[PDB]
Amino acid sequence: RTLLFKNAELLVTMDDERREIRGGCLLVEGNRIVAVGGDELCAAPADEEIDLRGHIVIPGLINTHHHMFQSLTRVIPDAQDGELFDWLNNLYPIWAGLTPEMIRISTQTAMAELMLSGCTTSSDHLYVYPNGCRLDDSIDGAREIGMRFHACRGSMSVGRSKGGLPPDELVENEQAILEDSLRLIHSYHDAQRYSMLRIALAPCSPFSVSRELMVKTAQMAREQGVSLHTHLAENDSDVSYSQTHFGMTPAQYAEDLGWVGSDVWHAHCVKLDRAGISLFARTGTGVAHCPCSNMRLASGIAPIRAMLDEGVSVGLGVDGSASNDAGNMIAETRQAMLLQRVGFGPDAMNARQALEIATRGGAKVLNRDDIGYLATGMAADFVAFDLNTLNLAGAKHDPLAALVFCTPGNVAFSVINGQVVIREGVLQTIDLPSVVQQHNRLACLLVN
Amino acid sequence: RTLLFKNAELLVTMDDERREIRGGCLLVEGNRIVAVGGDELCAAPADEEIDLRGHIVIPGLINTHHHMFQSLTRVIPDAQDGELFDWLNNLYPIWAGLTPEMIRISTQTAMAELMLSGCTTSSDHLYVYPNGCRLDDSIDGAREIGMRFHACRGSMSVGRSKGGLPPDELVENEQAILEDSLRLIHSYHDAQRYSMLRIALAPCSPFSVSRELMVKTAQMAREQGVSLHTHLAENDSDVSYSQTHFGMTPAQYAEDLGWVGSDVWHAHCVKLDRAGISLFARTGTGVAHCPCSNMRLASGIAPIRAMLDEGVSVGLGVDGSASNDAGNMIAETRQAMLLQRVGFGPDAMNARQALEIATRGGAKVLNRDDIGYLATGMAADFVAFDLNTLNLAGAKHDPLAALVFCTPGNVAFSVINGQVVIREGVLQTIDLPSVVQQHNRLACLLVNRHR
Numbered sequence: 001r002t003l004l005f006k007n008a009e010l011l012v013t014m015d016d017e018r019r020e021i022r023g024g025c026l027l028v029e030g031n032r033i034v035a036v037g038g039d040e041l042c043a044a045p046a047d048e049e050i051d052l053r054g055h056i057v058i059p060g061l062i063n064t065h066h067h068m069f070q071s072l073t074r075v076i077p078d079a080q081d082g083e084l085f086d087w088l089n090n091l092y093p094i095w096a097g098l099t100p101e102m103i104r105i106s107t108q109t110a111m112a113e114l115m116l117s118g119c120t121t122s123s124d125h126l127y128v129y130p131n132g133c134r135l136d137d138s139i140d141g142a143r144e145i146g147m148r149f150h151a152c153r154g155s156m157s158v159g160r161s162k163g164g165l166p167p168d169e170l171v172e173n174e175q176a177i178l179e180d181s182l183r184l185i186h187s188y189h190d191a192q193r194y195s196m197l198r199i200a201l202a203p204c205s206p207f208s209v210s211r212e213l214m215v216k217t218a219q220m221a222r223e224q225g226v227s228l229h230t231h232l233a234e235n236d237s238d239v240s241y242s243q244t245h246f247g248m249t250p251a252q253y254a255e256d257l258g259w260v261g262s263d264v265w266h267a268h269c270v271k272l273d274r275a276g277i278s279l280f281a282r283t284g285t286g287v288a289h290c291p292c293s294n295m296r297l298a299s300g301i302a303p304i305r306a307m308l309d310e311g312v313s314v315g316l317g318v319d320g321s322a323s324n325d326a327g328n329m330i331a332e333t334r335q336a337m338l339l340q341r342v343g344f345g346p347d348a349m350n351a352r353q354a355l356e357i358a359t360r361g362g363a364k365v366l367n368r369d370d371i372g373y374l375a376t377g378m379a380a381d382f383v384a385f386d387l388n389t390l391n392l393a394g395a396k397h398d399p400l401a402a403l404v405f406c407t408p409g410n411v412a413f414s415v416i417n418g419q420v421v422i423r424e425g426v427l428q429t430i431d432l433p434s435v436v437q438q439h440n441r442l443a444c445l446l447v448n
Numbered sequence: 449r450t451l452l453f454k455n456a457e458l459l460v461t462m463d464d465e466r467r468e469i470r471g472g473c474l475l476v477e478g479n480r481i482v483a484v485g486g487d488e489l490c491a492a493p494a495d496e497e498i499d500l501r502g503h504i505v506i507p508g509l510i511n512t513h514h515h516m517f518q519s520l521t522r523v524i525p526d527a528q529d530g531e532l533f534d535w536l537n538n539l540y541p542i543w544a545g546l547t548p549e550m551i552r553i554s555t556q557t558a559m560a561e562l563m564l565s566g567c568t569t570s571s572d573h574l575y576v577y578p579n580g581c582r583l584d585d586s587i588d589g590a591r592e593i594g595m596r597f598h599a600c601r602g603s604m605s606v607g608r609s610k611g612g613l614p615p616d617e618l619v620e621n622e623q624a625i626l627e628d629s630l631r632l633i634h635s636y637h638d639a640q641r642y643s644m645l646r647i648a649l650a651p652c653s654p655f656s657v658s659r660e661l662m663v664k665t666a667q668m669a670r671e672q673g674v675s676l677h678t679h680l681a682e683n684d685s686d687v688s689y690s691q692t693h694f695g696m697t698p699a700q701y702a703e704d705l706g707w708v709g710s711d712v713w714h715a716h717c718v719k720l721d722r723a724g725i726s727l728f729a730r731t732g733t734g735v736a737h738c739p740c741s742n743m744r745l746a747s748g749i750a751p752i753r754a755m756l757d758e759g760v761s762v763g764l765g766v767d768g769s770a771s772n773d774a775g776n777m778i779a780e781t782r783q784a785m786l787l788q789r790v791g792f793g794p795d796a797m798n799a800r801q802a803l804e805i806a807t808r809g810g811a812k813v814l815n816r817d818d819i820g821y822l823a824t825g826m827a828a829d830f831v832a833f834d835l836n837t838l839n840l841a842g843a844k845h846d847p848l849a850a851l852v853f854c855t856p857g858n859v860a861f862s863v864i865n866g867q868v869v870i871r872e873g874v875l876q877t878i879d880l881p882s883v884v885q886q887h888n889r890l891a892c893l894l895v896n897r898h899r
């Protein structure tokens with residue numbers, strides 16, 4: 001089954017030559033791209049043909065950190081302002097009322113926002129399982145909306161009966177965690193090229209569980225070929241806690257647990273030291289940059305430019321909607337460029353460097369070689385922005401930079417795994433007005 | 449004439465009690481607000497009745513710095529990255545081809561972006577006048593789109609062949625600057641309440657003109673009762689240049705020039721020191737905070753929280769579209785909150801403080817008491833965001849914070865001076881797709897100009 005995107009004003013490929021093709025054309029069969037180029041690919045009819053004049057086509061953005069259940073709890077009044085301590089203490093007793101239907105809908109809500117703002121692959125970090133919630137419920141929602149999903153079995157063990165902050169209803173026994181995590185891997189992990197569903201193992205933070213679960217998790221992930229994800233060094237407290245309790249820097253504590261390698265990626269890394277950047281570069285460890293979260297939570301300016309210069313694989317993440325509180329992937333791309341410039345100078349990040357993090361960087365951090373750019377044999381994952389909107393008026397001097405320097409609206413078109421999921425700005429895979437409405441009634445229900 | 453906006457989910461007034469009314473209602477006739485309240489107001493006679501169920505109403509956001517002509521020259525490739533020195537030198541020769549029509553259309557383009565993102569009053573800082581352009585051309589476009597406009601006669605005298613970066617076609621004779629400025633005040637400045645047009649005088653920077661032109665300009669604003677605007681201390685260079693040539697801080701050189709007072713407002717002020725903050729606080733001098741520009745140009749994090757604690761009047765600006773490069777007022781409000789928090793901590797700026805900068809603070813910096821919040825006798829300047837979009841899904845726990853912490857789309861409705869200028873997300877005062885087409889059609893002409 002064939003799909004032809006023809007005569008885009010600018011087809012950004014992100015391929016090995018970083019081709020930016022004027023009048024560029026894209027030919028798809030099934031889930032993969034057959035060729036990127038020009039009018040040469042239009043001479044035969046295709047089962048579907050979509051004119052893309054006046055549009056920029058880019059590879060689909062890849063979101064590499066999230067907490068989609070938190071899209072049910074944005075701007076909770078008690079949590080909008082204050083210290084991360086009050087943030088957790090105010091939000092945990094609420095999240096203790098999450099029901100499996102809420103995980104299933106809240107996955108689609110968060111996913112719809114990312115998709116309409118240009119994202120074709122996302123991870124999630126669901127690490128709470130009250131009232132019979134399961135990673136399966138999140139997966140059911142991802143399958144319905146058609147997004148490429150990296151589901152993380154997040155976990156927590158240290159609750160209030162062990163000196164921790166999470167209530168006891170929101171922690172679990174480490175043996176039950178390893179057993180659910182292995183059941184999830186066996187039931188959902190597709191390791192083949194163009195997989196639409198993959199599992200990674202992901203304790204919430206190296207301090208939310210025992211060191212034994214950190215090591216046992218990595219052993220299991222290595223045995224099964226899945227990735228490892230966690231929160232690492234997102235603020236000053238993280239650094240102090242690691243030095244005070246384990247006498248190590250967060251990077252050193254990470255290396256010590258086996259949690260380095262191209263099958264690992266750490267979220268935030270705002271306070272990664274120079275030695276930790278060197279370590280992550282030579283072992284291939286990835287970082288998920290969450291610039292809006294780092295600002296909205298007063299975490300800091302991660303040394304992203306320092307990491308890229310030294311060779312670190314960096315992807316982009318919006319983080320949970322209680323710590324952003326938006327899910328706008330292209331705006332997060334914009335934000336990474338703005339925040340890097342104000343922290344490190346007028347040469348710290350341009351439009352193409354940001355967009356590369358949001359595409360190739362995310363694929364690398366998720367340990368995937370089949371997404372992130374547009375070339376023969378790659379997954380058919382791309383979006384298209386209308387260039388004649390008011391938002392981009394006067395910015396056609398560079399359609400690629402226009403997306404990062406201006407604030408565009410929704411994408412016009414989106415193709416995930418070869419399937420046209422957004423047409424003229426309308427989500428095709430779900431009844432979006434109905435899901436949004438349902439989402440808001442559960443959020444009202446969850447909060448009261 | 450009469451208009452009723454009824455049953456909003458949340459009507460945030462920004463009034464003296466900061467009332468945030470559930471089911472809030474707004475009763476307008478002409479340009480006034482006649483009454484603010486609740487269900488009681490449905491007994492009131494109205495010519496037209498507008499249901500705002502599921503919407504949040506906020507007072508219209510007030511933009512206090514711009515360069516609307518630069519919306520024809522966004523993401524210019526040579527200017528996307530590098531030092532401000534390369535930014536100026538790549539963009540000056542381009543802007544030297546501006547025609548009066550380009551000013552007339554780009555003003556509408558720039559204003560439309562602001563209006564669809566929640567802004568009802570904006571100033572501008574047009575400081576180039578090549579090929580017979582005039583501030584009149586800006587004004588013609590503003591009158592057509594219906595936005596409340598504070599038009600600044602920007603000016604520049606220190607150009608090339610005189611030790612400056614602006615080319616010689618983009619400088620002007622200091623006597624002609626004062627003479628066209630007095631013509632603009634006499635012909636356009638409406639000092640009456642609910643004025644839709646006010647003039648302010650605004651040399652580009654204290655160093656872009658002679659000291660005489662700054663003082664003569666300051667005397668004229670005082671003599672005519674108008675305001676004064678300029679860029680002050682936006683970067684390290686600006687501060688060092690002042691210490692080097694005049695042995696003073698930019699705030700000191702400003703006070704030394706007469707350029708302080710409640711009729712003055714300075715853009716950026718990224719490097720204002722503690723004493724200059726105190727100086728601005730006791731003199732009532734205003735600042736226009738421009739967070740996106742401050743980042744996209746690697747200027748720095750301005751100490752807005754320090755200024756508010758000291759009593760400084762702070763408004764918000766998007767700045768010219770070549771140093772942002774967007775014109776989204778609500779996202780600029782969000783951005784000001786994010787950037788203050790990452791610079792100074794989790795208590796440096798909440799949703800309500802940022803929105804207050806975008807409303808009352810913008811009204812104060814402009815020296816206006818008839819806009820900026822919703823109460824009996826205020827101008828009918830407000831917008832309404834649909835709360836049931838995907839962007840705000842799960843954020844109805846606080847509709848006001850939702851506007852700052854999430855990324856909403858365009859407004860659903862907009863009212864400036866009593867005129868419903870946006871209906872169900874659709875701009876009413878111009879043929880927007882057609883103006884957008886012309887805008888891109890002229891920017892192409894400008895960029896391929898011979899230079």
Ligand SMILES: [Zn+2]
Pocket residue numbers: 065066067125231267319320
């Ligand atoms: Zn997170």
Ligand SMILES: [Zn+2]
Pocket residue numbers: 513514515573679715767768
């Ligand atoms: Zn400016």
